C-alpha cells in the first residue's frame, strides 16, 4: 500500500518546491498519475482480502472508495484554480497542502487494519477540512459552520474511542481480521446496549442521521468548492464504511437497536426530499439531497443483508460522483452571478447550452435513471427493505417520486424559462469547466458497464 | 537545455521516485511475512529441482 | 457444440417438420433466406475461417485450478486462528460453487420454459422439481446468515436445525 | 403592454372592458358568424339603453349586476388568440430570444464573418454612449421633486437628443428571432 | 409557416379595407389620419368594435390599455407595425 | 424562394349582404329596431368557393360513386370469369 | 485505465466456480445423488450435547 | 429574396472547441487501443483449456484465458 502512500506524500515537497505558476499543472498531473496507480487496487479476490502488511489491508469495499478519493483531488484542483487567482503563492501552496493532507489521511483511513489507527486517521481528517472551511470560505457564517462541523463530530466520536479501548481490554485485540474471526454474540444487557450506542453514534453523526444532520447544510454551503466536493464525495462515506466494518461485533443486538435509526432514516428521507422542494439556495438543496441519499444508505447498512450491503456500496460511490458534479455546476453558476440564489439567474439554457446538457445529465443521475449505478444501489436497497418488511415500499416510492420532482425542479428553475434581463455578465463556459464536468460524468456512465467493481465484498 | 531546465523541472521527478520507493518498501515488508511460505495445507508444494522459494 | 457439456445442459433431440408446400406459389421466406445466406453467411464464414487459421498458427493452453481439501470449521480448536482461516476460505469457495450450481439449474429451467412453448406447464415438471429440491437445500444451508456470514454461523445454524430434527424424531418415537 | 398604467380605471374604461369581454365570450358561445352578429347587435343594444344615465350611484349599481351576470355565463373555455397570455403559442419563441450583449462575447473568428453588421453595431454602441450622458441629465431635470408619480417617460426635446431609456426598447430581439 | 413578410403598405390597405367595410363610416370621406371621435363622429363603443375587427382581421389581440387610445387608422397601422416589427 | 407576387386586394364594393344568412340576420334585427354595421365585413365567407356547402352524410359519401362503379365492374367481371 | 480494468484477470474465480459446479453437477447427476445436500457439514463429525430431559 | 437577417445567438466557438479537444484526446489514446486489441484477438488468439500434465505445476498467470489478462 506504500506504493500509493509515498507518492501522495511526495506531492507536498513537489508542491512547495514548484514555480509560482506551475503549482496547478504539477499537482494535477501527479495527482492524476497517483489515481492511475491506485486504479490497480480494483483487482480484488473472492477470498478474504488484500492483506499487504500488519498495518494496511485492502478490500473490495475499500478499493472503490480509495479510487474515488484519488480521483477527486485533480477535480478539486481544477475547481479551485479559478477563485484562488488573486491570492499569494504561499497561501495557494497551503491550500494545495491541505488538500494533499486530506487525501493522505483518507487513503490511510480506508486501509487501516487497526480500529484505533482507523479512529486516529478518521479524526485526523477533521483538521484539514476545518481549516479549509474557516480560512477560504466567503461568508461570515463559515466560522459558525466550522464550529458545528467540529463539535457534532467529536460529540459522536469521543464515546467511540472509549468503547474501542474497552473492547481491546476484553477481546485483547482490535485488528479487524481477528475481530471478524473471533466475533461473539452480544447479550441483551444495558452495558451492551450502551456499547452498541457508543459504537454506532460516531458513524451515525457523519452520514448524517436525520436528527443529527444540522451541521451538514451549514458546512457544505459555507465551504469553498473543493471543500464541498470533498465533504459530499468522500467524507460522508466514512460513516458508512465505519458502520459496515463495526456491525460485525454488534450482532445480534442490532436486531433490536436498529429500530429507532431505521424509523429516523425512513421518515427523514421523506422529510429532506420534501425540504428540497422549498429551497431558495442551490447548495442547500444539494446538501439536503445528500442527506436523503445517506438516509437510504443508513437503512441499507442497518438491515445488514447481502443485497443491502451491495446496494449501499454502489449508492455511496454513485452519490459521491453525482453530488460532486452538482456542486461543481452550482459553483460555475455562482462564479458568474455571485449570488447562490436559485431564482436569480434563469433561462441559462439559451446562453450556455453545453452547460445545460451537463445540468441535465447530472439531474438524470441524481434522479436515479436506469441503468445508472445510482439506480442499481437504489433498487438493491429497496428490494432488501421489501424483504425486511413489505410496507417500506410506500416510503421508498414516495422518496423516489419526490427526488425526481426536486431534481427536475432544480433543472427547470435554473436552465429553462426566460433569461434574466439585467444580468449581462454571463460569459461563455471555459474549457476548464467543461473538462471538469466530463471528468465527473464519464466515470459514472462507464462504471455502469462493470458494476461488480463497486458492489462491495458480498458480490 | 540541459543543466538549465533541470533547475526548473527538478521537482517533477520526485513523485515517480516515491512510487518506486513505495514498491521497494512493499516488497521489503513482504519479506518479513514468510513464516508460512510453502507451509499452508492448501498449497503444500514440493519444490522444483531448481527452485528456492515458492513465491517472493 | 463441444464448447459445453451436453449432460450438464441437456436438450431434447430437436424434432423439426418437413416443408409440405400445398400450393405452387413461391413463398418469399425461402428465396429471402437463400439470399441472406449468400450475402451474409458466406462472408462471415470465410472471415471465421481466416481467424481460426490464424488462431491455429498460435496454440497455447490455460488450466483449471485444483484446490486441495483442508479440515473444516468442525475440526478446529476454539481459538486456533490458522485452521479457522483455512476452513473459512474453504467454506467460502464451497458457497460460491453452490451458488453456481443453483445458477445452472435455473438456466435449465429458463431454457425449458422458452423451449416447450405453449405446453411448458406440463413439459417442464422435471426442471421445476429439480429446482425445488436444489432451492430447498440451498435455503437450508444459507438462508438467514445475513451480512457478516461465516462458517461458524453456518455450523451453528446446522446444529440448531439438527437438534430440532432430533427432538422431533424423539417425540415421534415416544408418541 | 406599451402604455404606462394609471393609478385607477375610470367608470368608462370599466364599462368598455366589460363590453369587449362580453362580446368576446359571446363570440365563443356563438360560433357561427351570422348568429354572433345578431346576438352582438342585441348585446350592443342592451348596453346602449343605459348610455345616458346621469346618476353615478345608479351607474355603479349597474355594471356590477352586469359583471355578476358575465361571471355566471362566461364560457369557461373562451377562444384565445394563439399568441395571447392564454394561447397555445404564447411564449413559444422566448427560448430563441438572445440578448444583444451576447455578441460582445463572440470569438474574433466569429466576428470575422458578418463584418458590416459589427461595424454598424459599433456605431450603435457609440450613439448609445453619448445619448446616455445626455439622457441622465434630461431625466434628472424633467422629473418632479420627490420622485416620479407615473412611469411615463418624456420624449426628446432638443435636436440631437434621443428619448430617455431607449436602448432596451429599440434593441428588442424580435417577435420571432428564429 | 410560409407566411409572407407583410409590409406597411399591406397593413395600411387592410386597415382601410376593414374600415370601409364598416357601414357607419362613409368610405369616400375616410382617410388615414381621420380621427374616430370627431372626424367621423363615432362613439367609444364603436371604437372598441373597430379594435375588435382589427384584432380578428390580423389574428392577434391588442390589450385594453393600448387599444383604448388608438383613435386614427394611421396610429392603428403604426401599432400593428411596431408589434409585428415591419421594416418598410 | 418565397411568395413575392405583390398580391392586390379585391374591390371592397364587391361584398353585399344580399343572398346570405346575414340578410335574414339584418331582417330579424330590423324587426326590433336595430341594424348590423359589420355585416359586409363577413360577406366573403358566403361568396366564392365557400358559397356551396356539403352535408355530413355527403361528406361521408365522398367517393361512393366511382368506387361503386368499380365495385359493380369488378363483380360483373368475376361473375363472367367464374362462369367458365 | 478503463481498458486495464476491463481486462483484469479473474481473481474473483467466477469461471473457476462455474467449472467446479459443472463437473460436480455432472458427477452427481450421473450417480443419482440428490444434487445439493441440505447439510453443509457431515453430521458424523459433529458432537451434539445429549439433553436427557 | 435577399431578406436574410442576422441571428443573435451566443458564441458556439468555445463549446465546439472543447468538444473537438475532448474527442481528439480520447481518440488519440483509444484508436491505438482498439487496433491493438483487435490485432491481439485476431493473431494471438485465446488460450484453450487443457488438463494439467503430470509433474508440471503451472504459473499463476497460466490459469487465465485472455492473453491481455494473462
Ligand atoms: C440510445 C443508443 C445510443 C447509441 C449511440 C452511442 C451514444 C454514446 C453516448 C455516450 C454518453 C454520452 C456522453 C454524455 C455527455 C454528452 C456529450 C455532449 O455534450 O454531446 C455533444 C454532441 C454534439 O452536440 P452539440 O450540438 O455540439 O451540443 C448541443 C447541446 O449540447 C444540446 O445537445 P442535445 O440536446 O442533443 O443533448 C445531448 C444528449 C447527450 O447528453 C446526455 O444526456 C447523455 C447521457 C444520458 C444518460 C444519463 C444518465 C442515466 C444513466 C444511463 C447510463 C447509460 C450508459 C451505458 C454505458 C455507456 C458507456 C460509457 O442528451 C440527450 O439527447 C438526451 C437523451 C436521453 C437518453 C435517456 C435514455 C437512457 C437509457 C438508454 C439505454 C441505455 C442502456 C441500453 C440497454 C439495452 C440496449 C443495449 O452531441 C452528441 O453527440 C449526443 C450524445 C449522444 C446521445 C446520448 C443518448 C443515448 C446514449 C446513452 C449512453 C450510451 C448507450 C449505450 C448503449 C448502446 C447500444
Ligand atoms: C464482398 C465482401 C468480401 C469480404 C467478406 C469478408 C469480410 C467482410 C464480411 C465478413 C466479416 C463480417 C464482420 C466480422 C466481424 C468480426 C471480424 C473481426 O475483425 O474480428 C476481430 C476479432 C475476432 O474475434 P475473436 O478473436 O474470434 O474473439 C475473441 C473475443 O472477442 C475476445 O473478447 P475480447 O475480450 O477481445 O472482447 C472485447 C470487446 C469489448 O472490448 C473492451 O472491453 C474494451 C474496453 C475498453 C473500455 C474503455 C474504452 C476507452 C474509454 C472510452 C471513454 C469514452 C469517453 O470487444 C467488443 O465489445 C466487440 C463488440 C462486438 C459487438 C457485436 C454486435 C453486438 C450487438 C449486441 C446487441 C444487439 C442489439 C442491439 O474481434 C475483435 O477484433 C473485436 C474488436 C473490439 C474492439 C474494441 C475497441 C475498444 C476501444 C477502447 C477505447 C475506445 C475509445 C473510443 C474510440 C475507440 C475506437 C473507435
Ligand atoms: C458522440 C456520439 C457517439 C459516438 C461514439 C459511438 C460508439 C459508442 C460505443 C460506446 C458505448 C456503447 C456501450 C457498448 C460497450 C462496449 C464495451 C463493453 O462491452 O466492454 C466493457 C468493458 O469495460 C469495462 O468493463 C468498464 C470500464 C471500467 C471503468 C473504470 C473507470 C476509469 C477510471 C477513472 C477514475 C475512477 C472515478 C470513479 C471512482 C469509482 C464490458 O465488457 P465485459 O463483458 O464486462 O468484459 C470485458 C472483456 N473480457 C471478457 C475480456 C473480460
Ligand atoms: C435526536 C436526534 C437523533 C439522535 C439519535 C437517536 C437514537 C437513540 C435511541 C436509543 C436506542 C434505544 C435505547 C434503549 C432501547 C432498549 C429497549 C427499550 O426501549 O424497551 C423497553 C425498555 O424499558 C424502558 O425503556 C426502561 C428504560 C426507561 C428510561 C429510558 C428513558 C425514556 C426516554 C428517553 C429518550 C431520550 C434519548 C436522548 C437522551 C439524551 C423494554 O423493557 P425490558 O424488556 O424490561 O428491558 C430491555 C433491556 N434489557 C433487556 C437490557 C434489560
Ligand atoms: C451527537 C451527540 C451524541 C453524544 C454521544 C452519544 C452516544 C452515547 C453512548 C454512551 C456514551 C458512553 C458509553 C460507554 C462506552 C462503552 C463502554 C461500555 O460499553 O462499557 C459498559 C459501561 O456502560 C456504561 O457505563 C454506560 C454509562 C453511560 C453514562 C453516560 C450517559 C450519556 C447519556 C445517556 C443517555 C443517552 C444515551 C444514547 C444517546 C445517543 C446520542 C443522542 C459496560 O462495562 P462494565 O460496566 O465495566 O461491565 C459491566 C459490569 N460492571
Ligand atoms: C355572454 C357573456 C355574458 C354577458 C352578460 C353581460 C351583461 C352586460 C349588460 C349591462 C348593461 C350596461 O351597459 S351597464 C351600465 C354602466 N353605466 C353606464 O353605461 C353609464 C354611462 N355610460 C358610459 O359611460 C359608456 O362608457 C358609454 C357612454 C356607452 C360609452 O362611452 P365612450 O363614449 O367614452 O365610448
TrEMBL record, chain A:
It is a multi-pass membrane protein. Residues 112-401 form the NADH:quinone oxidoreductase/Mrp antiporter transmembrane domain. GO terms for cellular component: mitochondrial membrane. GO terms for molecular function: NADH dehydrogenase (ubiquinone) activity. Its main location: mitochondrion. The chain crosses the membrane at residues 21-41, 61-80, 92-110, 116-133, 145-167, 193-216, 223-244, 256-277, 284-303, 309-330, 351-369, 389-412, 433-449. It catalyses: a ubiquinone + NADH + 5 H(+)(in) = a ubiquinol + NAD(+) + 4 H(+)(out). This is NADH-ubiquinone oxidoreductase chain 4. It comes from Sus scrofa. The gene is NADH4.
Automatic annotation (TrEMBL), chain B:
It comes from the Eukaryota. Belongs to the complex I NDUFB1 subunit family. It comes from Sus scrofa (Pig). It is found in: Mitochondrion inner membrane. It holds the Pfam family NADH_oxidored. It is a single-pass membrane protein. Keywords: Electron transport, Membrane, Mitochondrion, Mitochondrion inner membrane, Respiratory chain, Transmembrane, Transmembrane helix, Transport. One of its GO terms (cellular component) is nuclear speck. Complex I is composed of 45 different subunits. Its main location: mitochondrion. This is NADH dehydrogenase [ubiquinone] 1 beta subcomplex subunit 1.
From TrEMBL, chain D:
One of its GO terms (biological process) is mitochondrial electron transport, NADH to ubiquinone. Residues 135-164 are annotated as: Disordered. Keywords: Acetylation, Electron transport, Membrane, Mitochondrion, Mitochondrion inner membrane, Phosphoprotein, Respiratory chain, Transport. InterPro entries: Complex1_LYR_dom, Complex1_LYR_NDUFB9_LYRM3, NDUFB9. CDD domains: Complex1_LYR_NDUFB9_LYRM3 (cd20263). One of its GO terms (cellular component) is mitochondrial inner membrane. Residues 13-71 form the Complex 1 LYR protein domain. It is a peripheral membrane protein. It is found in: Mitochondrion inner membrane. Belongs to the complex I LYR family. Accessory subunit of the mitochondrial membrane respiratory chain NADH dehydrogenase (Complex I), that is believed to be not involved in catalysis. Complex I functions in the transfer of electrons from NADH to the respiratory chain. The immediate electron acceptor for the enzyme is believed to be ubiquinone. Mammalian complex I is composed of 45 different subunits. This is NADH dehydrogenase [ubiquinone] 1 beta subcomplex subunit 9. The gene is NDUFB9.
Automatic annotation (TrEMBL), chain H:
The chain crosses the membrane at residues 24-44. It is found in: Mitochondrion inner membrane. Complex I is composed of 45 different subunits. Belongs to the complex I NDUFB5 subunit family. Accessory subunit of the mitochondrial membrane respiratory chain NADH dehydrogenase (Complex I), that is believed not to be involved in catalysis. Complex I functions in the transfer of electrons from NADH to the respiratory chain. The immediate electron acceptor for the enzyme is believed to be ubiquinone. This is NADH dehydrogenase [ubiquinone] 1 beta subcomplex subunit 5, mitochondrial. The lineage of its organism: Eukaryota, Metazoa, Chordata, Craniata, Vertebrata. The gene is NDUFB5. The chain holds residues 50 to 119 of 189 of the full protein.
Amino acid at each position: 500500500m506504500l506504493k500509493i502512500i509515498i507518492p501522495t506524500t511526495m506531492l507536498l515537497p513537489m508542491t512547495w518546491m514548484s514555480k509560482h505558476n506551475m503549482i496547478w499543472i504539477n499537482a494535477t498531473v501527479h495527482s492524476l498519475l497517483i489515481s492511475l496507480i491506485s486504479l490497480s487496487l480494483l483487482n480484488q479476490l473472492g477470498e478474504n482480502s488484500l492483506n499487504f502488511s500488519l498495518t494496511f489491508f485492502s478490500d473490495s469495499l475499500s478499493a472503490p472508495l480509495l479510487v474515488l478519493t484519488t480521483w477527486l483531488l485533480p477535480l478539486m484542483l481544477m475547481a479551485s484554480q479559478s477563485h484562488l487567482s488573486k491570492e499569494t503563492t504561499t497561501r495557494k501552496k497551503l491550500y494545495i497542502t491541505m488538500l494533499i493532507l486530506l487525501q493522505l489521511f483518507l487513503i490511510m483511513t480506508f486501509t487501516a487494519t487497526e480500529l484505533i489507527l482507523f479512529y486516529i486517521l478518521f479524526e485526523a481528517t477533521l483538521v484539514p477540512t476545518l481549516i479549509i472551511i474557516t480560512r477560504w470560505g466567503n461568508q461570515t457564517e463559515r466560522l459558525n459552520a466550522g464550529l458545528y462541523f467540529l463539535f457534532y463530530t467529536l460529540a459522536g466520536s469521543l464515546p467511540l474511542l472509549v468503547a474501542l479501548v474497552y473492547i481491546q481490554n476484553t477481546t485483547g485485540s482490535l485488528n479487524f481480521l481477528i475481530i471478524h474471526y473471533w466475533s461473539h454474540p452480544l447479550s441483551n444487557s444495558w452495558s451492551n446496549i450502551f456499547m452498541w450506542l457508543a459504537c454506532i453514534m460516531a458513524f451515525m453523526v457523519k452520514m448524517p442521521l436525520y436528527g443529527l444532520h444540522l451541521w451538514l447544510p451549514k458546512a457544505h454551503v459555507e465551504a469553498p468548492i473543493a471543500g464541498s466536493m470533498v465533504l459530499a464525495a468522500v467524507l460522508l462515506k466514512l460513516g458508512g464504511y465505519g458502520m459496515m466494518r463495526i456491525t460485525t461485533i454488534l450482532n445480534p443486538l442490532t436486531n433490536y437497536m436498529a429500530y429507532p435509526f431505521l424509523m429516523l432514516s425512513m421518515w427523514g428521507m421523506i422529510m429532506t426530499s420534501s425540504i428540497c422542494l422549498r429551497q431558495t439556495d442551490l447548495k442547500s438543496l444539494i446538501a439536503y439531497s445528500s442527506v436523503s441519499h445517506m438516509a437510504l444508505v443508513i437503512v441499507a447498512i442497518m438491515i445488514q443483508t447481502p443485497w443491502s450491503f451491495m446496494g449501499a456500496t454502489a449508492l455511496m460511490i454513485a452519490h459521491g460522483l453525482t453530488s460532486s458534479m452538482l456542486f461543481c455546476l452550482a459553483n460555475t453558476n455562482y462564479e458568474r452571478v455571485h449570488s447562490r440564489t436559485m431564482i436569480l439567474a434563469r433561462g441559462l439554457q439559451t446562453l450556455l447550452p453545453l452547460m445545460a446538457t451537463w445540468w441535465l445529465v447530472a439531474s438524470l443521475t441524481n434522479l436515479a435513471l436506469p441503468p445508472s449505478i445510482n439506480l442499481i444501489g437504489e433498487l438493491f436497497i429497496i428490494t432488501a427493505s421489501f424483504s425486511w418488511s413489505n410496507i417500506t415500499i410506500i416510503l421508498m416510492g414516495m422518496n423516489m417520486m419526490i427526488t425526481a420532482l426536486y431534481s427536475l425542479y432544480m433543472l427547470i428553475t435554473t436552465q429553462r424559462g426566460k433569461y434574466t434581463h439585467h444580468i449581462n455578465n454571463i460569459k461563455p463556459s471555459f474549457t476548464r469547466e467543461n473538462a471538469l464536468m466530463a471528468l465527473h460524468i464519464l466515470p459514472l456512465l462507464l462504471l455502469t458497464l462493470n458494476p461488480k467493481m463497486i458492489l462491495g465484498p458480498l458480490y | 537545455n540541459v543543466l538549465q531546465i533541470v533547475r526548473d523541472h527538478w521537482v517533477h521527478i520526485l513523485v515517480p521516485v516515491g512510487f518506486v520507493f513505495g514498491c521497494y518498501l512493499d516488497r521489503r515488508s513482504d519479506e518479513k511475512l514468510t513464516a508460512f511460505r510453502n507451509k499452508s495445507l492448501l498449497f503444500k508444494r514440493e519444490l522444483r529441482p531448481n527452485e528456492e522459494v515458492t513465491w517472493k | 457444440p463441444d464448447s459445453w457439456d451436453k449432460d450438464v445442459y441437456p436438450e431434447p433431440p430437436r424434432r423439426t417438420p418437413a416443408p409440405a408446400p400445398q400450393t405452387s406459389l413461391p413463398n418469399p421466406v425461402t428465396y429471402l433466406t437463400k439470399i441472406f445466406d449468400l450475402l451474409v453467411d458466406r462472408p462471415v464464414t470465410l472471415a471465421r475461417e481466416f481467424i481460426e487459421q490464424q488462431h491455429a498458427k498460435n496454440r497455447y493452453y490455460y488450466y483449471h485450478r485444483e484446490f486441495r481439501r483442508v479440515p473444516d470449521i468442525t475440526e478446529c480448536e476454539e481459538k486456533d486462528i490458522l485452521c479457522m482461516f483455512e476452513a473459512e476460505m474453504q467454506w467460502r469457495r464451497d458457497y460460491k460453487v453452490d451458488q453456481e450450481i443453483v445458477n445452472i439449474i435455473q438456466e435449465r429451467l429458463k431454457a425449458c420454459q422458452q423451449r416447450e412453448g405453449e405446453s411448458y406447464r406440463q413439459n417442464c415438471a422435471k426442471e421445476l422439481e429439480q429446482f425445488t429440491q436444489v432451492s430447498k437445500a440451498f435455503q437450508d444451508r444459507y438462508s438467514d446468515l445475513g451480512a457478516h456470514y461465516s462458517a461458524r454461523k453456518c455450523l451453528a445454524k446446522q446444529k440448531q436445525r439438527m437438534l430440532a430434527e432430533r427432538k422431533a424424531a424423539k417425540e415421534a418415537a415416544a408418541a | 403592454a406599451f402604455s404606462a398604467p394609471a393609478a385607477y380605471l375610470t367608470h368608462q374604461q370599466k364599462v368598455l372592458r366589460l363590453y369587449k369581454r362580453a362580446l368576446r365570450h359571446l363570440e365563443s358561445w356563438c360560433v357561427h358568424r351570422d348568429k354572433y352578429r345578431y346576438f352582438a347587435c342585441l348585446m350592443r343594444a342592451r348596453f346602449d339603453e343605459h348610455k345616458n344615465e346621469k346618476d353615478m350611484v345608479k351607474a355603479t349599481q349597474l355594471l356590477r349586476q352586469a359583471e355578476e351576470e358575465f361571471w355566471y355565463g362566461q364560457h369557461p373555455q373562451p377562444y384565445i388568440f394563439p399568441e395571447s397570455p392564454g394561447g397555445t403559442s404564447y411564449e413559444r419563441y422566448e427560448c430563441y430570444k438572445v440578448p444583444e450583449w451576447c455578441l460582445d462575447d463572440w470569438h474574433p473568428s466569429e466576428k470575422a464573418m458578418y463584418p458590416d453588421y459589427f461595424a454598424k453595431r459599433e456605431q450603435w454602441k457609440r450613439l448609445r454612449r453619448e445619448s446616455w450622458e445626455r439622457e441622465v441629465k434630461q431625466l434628472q431635470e424633467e422629473t418632479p421633486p420627490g420622485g416620479p408619480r407615473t412611469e411615463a417617460l418624456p420624449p426628446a426635446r432638443k435636436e440631437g437628443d434621443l428619448p430617455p431609456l431607449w436602448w432596451h426598447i429599440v434593441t428588442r430581439p424580435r417577435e420571432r428571432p428564429m | 409557416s410560409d407566411a409572407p413578410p407583410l409590409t406597411l403598405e399591406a397593413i395600411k390597405d387592410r386597415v382601410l379595407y376593414v374600415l370601409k367595410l364598416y357601414d357607419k363610416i362613409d368610405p369616400e370621406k375616410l382617410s388615414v389620419n381621420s380621427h374616430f371621435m370627431k372626424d367621423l363622429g363615432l362613439d367609444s363603443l364603436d371604437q372598441v368594435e373597430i379594435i375588435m375587427a382589427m384584432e380578428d382581421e390580423f389574428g392577434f389581440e391588442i390589450p385594453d390599455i393600448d387599444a383604448e387610445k388608438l383613435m386614427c387608422p394611421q396610429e392603428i397601422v403604426d401599432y400593428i407595425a411596431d408589434k409585428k416589427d415591419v421594416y418598410e | 424562394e418565397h411568395g413575392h407576387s405583390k398580391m392586390e386586394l379585391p374591390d371592397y364594393k364587391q361584398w353585399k349582404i344580399e343572398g346570405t344568412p346575414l340578410e335574414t340576420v339584418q331582417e330579424k334585427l330590423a324587426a326590433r329596431g336595430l341594424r348590423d354595421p359589420w355585416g359586409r365585413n363577413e360577406a366573403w365567407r358566403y361568396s366564392g368557393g365557400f358559397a356551396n356547402n356539403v352535408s355530413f352524410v355527403g361528406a361521408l359519401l365522398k367517393g361512393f360513386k366511382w368506387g361503386f362503379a368499380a365495385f359493380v365492374v369488378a363483380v360483373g367481371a368475376e361473375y363472367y370469369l367464374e362462369s367458365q | 485505465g478503463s481498458t486495464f480494468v476491463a481486462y483484469l484477470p479473474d481473481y474473483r474465480m467466477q469461471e473457476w466456480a462455474r467449472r467446479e459446479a459443472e463437473r460436480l453437477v455432472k458427477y452427481r447427476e450421473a450417480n443419482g445423488l440428490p444434487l445439493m445436500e441440505s447439510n453443509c457439514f457431515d453430521p458424523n463429525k459433529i458432537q451434539l450435547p445429549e439433553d436427557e430431559d | 429574396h435577399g431578406k436574410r437577417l442576422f441571428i443573435i445567438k451566443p458564441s458556439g466557438f468555445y463549446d465546439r472547441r472543447f468538444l473537438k479537444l475532448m474527442r481528439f484526446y480520447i481518440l488519440l489514446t483509444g484508436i491505438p487501443v482498439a487496433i491493438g486489441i483487435t490485432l491481439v484477438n485476431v493473431f494471438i488468439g485465446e488460450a484453450e483449456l487443457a488438463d494439467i500434465p503430470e509433474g508440471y505445476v503451472p504459473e499463476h498467470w497460466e490459469y487465465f484465458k485472455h492473453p491481455i489478462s494473462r
